[PDB]
Amino acid sequence: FGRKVPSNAKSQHNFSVIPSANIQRSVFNRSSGYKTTFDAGYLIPVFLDEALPGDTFHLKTSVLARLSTPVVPFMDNLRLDIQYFSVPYRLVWDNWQKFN
């Protein structure tokens, strides 16, 4: 019996593949200062920024906090701390994908 001939389906599929976008990434320093007054026990949002798809951030934080003057060297320990979170926009607005 004869042997079957190929179909063109694979070459037709290949012609339909769009090229990748050429992005023009760059590296730069985005340093910023922030100054404030606050009281203990509250969660204070001291840093806020917007990250794009394909960003990379490396963050160093310097802090100087001064306590307003105590009466005596009170005996209890007292930590200052800073915690950072990522929040995708689609978690905070249902229409974010439809907006895009």
Partner: peptide, 10 residues
Amino acid sequence: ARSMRGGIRL
């Protein structure tokens, strides 16, 4: 298997 035109449909 790459990024097709008109978005993804398998």
